[PDB]
Design a binder for this molecule. Structure first.
Ligand SMILES: [Zn+2]
Ligand SMILES: [Zn+2]
Lengths: 9, 572, 571, 6
């Protein structure tokens, strides 16, 4: 899990 | 037990089986029997004997009069629209012709046509067919403007407020401003004559329009003005719409305590009046899921969205834009919730259905596709990195690239260069380029995202924090710019502490990033410090995140109307 | 970064390496100097030279006055008891020998002996050697009853409060009643001569003696009596000892609200004055964890015992009776925590240590073995069920069958037939006989366990409800008379939700019993309902079960010393 | 379920 989650949808 | 069927249900099955011969005399039946015959035709699967009857506007007018069985009419209508016959377009075109014909008639016939148009447009916009709902509301508005009587002014205001809800759901934002200008002109000349119409519904639709356009501050201002215009005499539909839109507007302004009680009261009002299986209740649960998905409440947001989807999957199921919106909103929520484990079989399935429905009932260059093609893409890259075949890795990365580029172009054409949505597209492109080993322009994408996010949302905001966290993860892991990563990581953790406290999900990611940052520069005491902080954070996540189903957390009989709105107003 | 050794510490190692030549003149050193010489001998491992001088009462008298480094004396004293030489036994005998020599002497020399007796007797009571602390206290009690003066009865009552404490931990309950009656002789005599002696600690010791003999009605009566006479001027060790043993009487009285406000303040008050690594602090946690064990605070009940054992292990060396009792509670806590999982790996090891420590230091007929061997037998019972090999099962069940009756006989001799602990073993034997396939004997044991435990406790008690569940679980499987278990199971759920709510660990095996009972007769209108009950059971307790220990739960206490006392007393 | 309380 290199990155954070997506901004939004 | 095996109770026999009533004579009513047995007579229905004796008329349907002789439908083709007595189709003329059925149209003379009472309005509460005509629906049962048509619903039996739907149940038997004789949709073509039924779609041949719903296409006429006069027959569909008496079917709409049965408000008790509207939850069955929505299912029947949605079963017609994916059957192949375009009932939504035919009814709208027929109503437009009949309005253009009886525009010259007296006031009573025009008023009857306006009422028929209000109920038909409310049904079509309720069923999601927005593009076929303008042609009804536009015809009603045209009927309104002909005569300058007072009720015509008020019903022109009603046409404008209902038509504005259609265009916001159809993502025709550029015409929403003009519709609001027309509505406010009508209400200004209404107030000129000494009487004031209720401004809550119109200002709530403005709140929805500006939040969809990502004008968060003006959305907050307009939801303030909306909730300043809420009285007890308003219909509960208008009231719950205003509260849910204001709850969405409060979250983007980072005022969650107000949004908490707002969305709780909205869900309570939706459950108390409409029911647990109503489309408006499903909309309120969608907004509740958005609220929970924002403030750290992810293990229950999926459960909220699953309840929200299951209502829309039952009231009107199949290929519909509301079911597609529920799938898209759940898929991103399932993407966030299931992100820690790494599996994405279910989330990709719920994202693909949202893709496979919008592409069937909307044009390929529509904004609602852009809000969905991101989510699948946000899943694909996550499936891409966790895969092992390099060809599969590259193919899914390029597919996510195509989806993000199409969504970015749609958002840029719709809103513009300087907006939050375009910045989110830029951040998605930046993290994808990080995933695609193209780190040179990944920094450019991330800095372009942050300089737009922080300009509109301020130096301290959730989207800004997430974007700078992505930039820091890019710097410290792959571009080896360790000095620049420290300040960005500190900014991310600071904004997380200010907004969400110490229970934020991304704090784990930025703490692991800081661990890898300090391991490279050999500062082992900072490694130990942030390792202790990470263990404390994990304990905290294991402490105040208990199993509390949000469908029950809304409770029963909480602070009712004229109380939540008043507390929210005085809390400004 | 290579800090040079202090000349104090450097000179310590300078005389330890030359101990033999300067052995005589080390005893002439100051007490602060003298202790560090001896503590260095233990650190170097020269226990034989360390034990070469603690066997003298006079040398051990000066060492006992190092109050700050008492936690190091306990760790050295236990090291000698594992080293060989019985320094506890010789010191007690040597003190008792010299004590009788000043009976005809003046009270000036005499009063020094009681002061020596209380610090030495208190230390051995702290160190756990109750069999040797009793001989110390009985000697100093004799001096206080020779010359009739107002101060002599003021300390004779101070012997009997501590005599009754070294006989509660030594399981000499039969002689405990006589000491209390002997205490009232001097206590009433002092009261007549214009001195109302404080009946707080002395009444507080019956809160454990009568609790040990399962006299819950009498213990709770003396729980109220002991709690009234508390005073802010009392020593903190005296105060915390009352709260611990008063809280225990409330737990068995099926009262939970007033118990937690007492014992949490006992934890808070002990941690404040003493610290987080003091023997008195660990003594509070075991009593505190007893509360968590019975209120279904099972997740942190193991941790609080694990925390309690680590405190004693860091201070009480190796083979010490206090470590075994700390081992005892942790062994049982893991027994109920790992019940569904079956991971009785550390549960047996703690139980095996509990047998190992006690058998070395206590006689084979001592009652503490009966308490200790009972839990290990419960470990062996669940292990044989989980094991796949039937040859292993038939041997381990018999080994557990060996321990219960040996434990039961010791309970029968000291407590009488009509007591909870004797009926407690009857409940264990009934469950044991279910695994032993002696179903007819299991029926006899269960009815014995339910006609005796319920007879004196009452119709509504926690342990009585479990005893019903043991026999309710019988009729479900072996006897197959489901009508008998239909009324029995209905009693198990009934008492379960009165205090523990729906989400109780024993109720899971109770709701499942009703479905299993209903599944045999084909009933299904309740099986579907009770399946929803399990779904409610599976969530509601786990909704409020999130990880949270108890040391930060108590934290700082807004409640003061008086805020807890009056609240419990008026209610 | 598991056993009597000690
Ligand atoms: Zn057809
Ligand atoms: Zn030796």
């Amino acid at each position: 899990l290199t990155r954070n989650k997506g901004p939004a949808a | 037990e095996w109770i026999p069927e009533t004579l009513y249900n047995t007579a229905i099955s004796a008329v349907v089986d002789n439908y083709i011969r007595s189709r003329r005399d059925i149209r003379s039946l009472p309005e509460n029997i005509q629906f049962d015959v048509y619903y039996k035709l739907y149940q038997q699967g004789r949709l073509c004997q039924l779609g041949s009857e719903f296409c006429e506007l006069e027959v569909f007018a008496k079917v709409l009069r049965a408000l008790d069985k509207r939850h069955l009419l929505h299912h029947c209508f949605q079963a017609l629209m994916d059957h192949g016959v375009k009932v939504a377009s035919v009814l709208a075109y027929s109503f437009s012709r009949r309005c253009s014909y009886i525009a010259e008639s007296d006031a009573a016939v025009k008023e009857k046509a306006i009422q028929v148009g209000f109920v038909l447009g409310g049904f079509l916009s309720d069923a999601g067919w927005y593009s076929d709902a303008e042609k009804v509301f536009l015809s009603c508005l045209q009927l309104c403007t002909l005569h300058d009587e007072m009720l015509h002014w008020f019903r022109a205001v009603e046409c404008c407020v209902r038509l504005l809800h259609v265009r916001n759901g159809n993502c025709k934002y550029h015409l929403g401003e003009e519709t609001f200008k027309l509505a406010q002109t009508y209400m200004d000349k209404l107030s000129k004559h000494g009487q004031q119409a209720n401004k809550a519904a119109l200002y709530g639709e403005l709140c929805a329009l500006l939040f969809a356009k990502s004008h968060y501050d003006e959305a907050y201002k307009w939801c303030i003005e909306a909730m300043k215009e809420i009285t007890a005499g308003l219909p509960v539909k208008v009231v719950v719409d205003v509260l849910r839109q204001a709850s969405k507007a409060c979250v983007v302004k980072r005022e969650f305590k107000k949004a908490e009680q707002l969305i709780k009261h909205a869900v309570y009002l939706a459950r108390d009046h409409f029911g647990s299986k109503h489309p408006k209740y499903s909309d309120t649960l969608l907004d509740y899921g958005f609220y929970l998905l924002n403030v750290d409440n992810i293990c229950q947001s999926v459960a909220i969205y699953q309840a929200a989807l299951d209502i829309r999957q039952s009231v009107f199921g199949g290929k519909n834009i509301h079911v597609a919106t529920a799938h898209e909103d759940l898929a991103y929520s399932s993407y966030v919730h299931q992100y820690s484990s790494g599996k994405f079989d279910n989330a990709l399935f719920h994202a693909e259905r949202a893709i496979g429905i919008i592409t069937h009932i909307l044009p390929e260059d529509h904004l609602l596709l852009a809000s969905s093609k991101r989510v699948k893409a946000l899943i694909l890259e996550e499936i891409a990195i966790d895969c092992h075949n390099k060809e599969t890795e590259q193919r899914l990365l390029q597919e996510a690239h195509d989806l993000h580029l199409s969504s970015l172009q749609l958002a840029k054409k719709a809103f513009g260069e300087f907006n939050v949505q375009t910045a989110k597209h830029y951040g998605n492109l930046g993290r994808l380029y990080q995933s695609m080993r193209k780190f040179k322009e990944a920094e450019e994408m991330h800095i372009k995202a942050i300089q737009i996010k922080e300009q509109l949302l301020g130096q301290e905001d959730y989207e800004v924090a997430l974007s700078v966290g992505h930039l820091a993860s890019l710097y410290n892991y792959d571009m080896n710019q360790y000095e620049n990563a420290e300040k960005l990581y500190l900014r991310s953790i600071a904004i997380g502490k200010k907004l969400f406290g110490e229970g934020y999900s991304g704090l784990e990611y930025d703490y692991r990033g800081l661990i890898k940052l300090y391991n490279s520069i050999g500062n082992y005491e900072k490694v130990f410090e942030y390792h202790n902080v990470l263990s404390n954070w994990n304990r905290l996540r294991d402490r105040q995140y208990s199993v509390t189903d949000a469908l029950e957390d809304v409770s029963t009989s909480p602070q009712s109307t004229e109380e939540v709105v008043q507390s929210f107003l005085i809390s400004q």
